[PDB]
Design a protein around this nucleic acid. Structure first.
Ligand SMILES: [K+]
Length: 228
RNA sequence: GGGAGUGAAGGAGGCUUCGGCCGCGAAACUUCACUCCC
């Protein structure tokens, strides 16, 4: 694909035949994140599973040791004293079904959204099609839906991430910012990798982490050894 | 070796001959995968 000079340059910096260590990679990050903003670091792993087999779906969440160095605007749809509990946990905008029409008018000033199970009827059906493209819709297996809404909200704002393999058997997640210190990123990179392994399916066949990579928003990639 | 599509992820910037072009919509761009084609 037609690349820019900025990127053609980044290519000369990494060796595609070399399997870098989690730490070597963590040091390249700075030298690759040359876009005109604080690029995000990410890890991509091709998983030894059968995406078609519902029970071999790698899906979960995990807390990162050094956050995502990113501010997360969480919205909280709720019912009862739960509202008070959400406001307490630290959500940016708390509310009830009313939020539903507010969003149907064009309000998308949030990054995340959580909700108590008892509002999901209205939230599910109504906000379903408008929130669906951005992957904003609250879900139980996503960790976005729970009565312990303050704990869920507390967690997100602390740099907790989600991860679900895609239909091709690959899984991806952000693990920090290019501004992070080399080793902080590394702690974060091992964290996510360990999260994946603790979610290896029972009937999963063969080598689980077939490959694992490190990259930034606009830079190239470097294959790493998951156990470094 | 190159041209593309599809999925997921990251993403508010990306490219430029400096004329502007593209993107902040799912959409630019980039990554890992699933295919098509030359
Ligand atoms: K990328």
């Amino acid at each position: 694909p037609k690349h820019g000079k900025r990127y053609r340059a980044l290519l000369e910096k990494v060796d595609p035949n070399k399997i870098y260590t989690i730490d070597e990679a963590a040091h390249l990050v700075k030298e690759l994140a040359t876009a005109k903003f604080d690029e995000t670091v990410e890890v991509h792993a091709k998983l030894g599973i059968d995406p078609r087999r519902s029970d071999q779906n790698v899906r979960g969440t995990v807390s990162l040791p050094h956050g995502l160095g990113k501010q997360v605007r969480v919205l909280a749809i709720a019912k009862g004293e739960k509202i008070k509990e959400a406001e307490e946990a630290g959500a940016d905008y708390v509310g009830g079904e009313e939020i539903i029409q507010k969003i149907l008018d064009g309000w998308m000033d949030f990054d995340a959204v959580v909700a108590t199970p008892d509002v999901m009827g209205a939230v599910g059906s109504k906000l379903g099609r408008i929130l669906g493209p951005r992957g904003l819709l609250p879900n139980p297996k996503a960790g976005t839906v729970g009565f312990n809404i303050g704990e869920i909200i507390r967690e997100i704002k602390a740099g907790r991430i989600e991860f679900r393999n895609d239909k091709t058997g690959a899984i991806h997640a952000p693990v920090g910012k290019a501004s992070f210190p080399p080793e902080k990123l590394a702690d974060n990179i091992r964290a996510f990798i360990r999260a994946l392994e603790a979610h290896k399916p029972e009937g999963a066949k063969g080598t689980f982490l077939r490959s694992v990579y490190v990259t930034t928003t606009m830079g190239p990639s470097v294959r790493i050894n998951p156990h470094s």
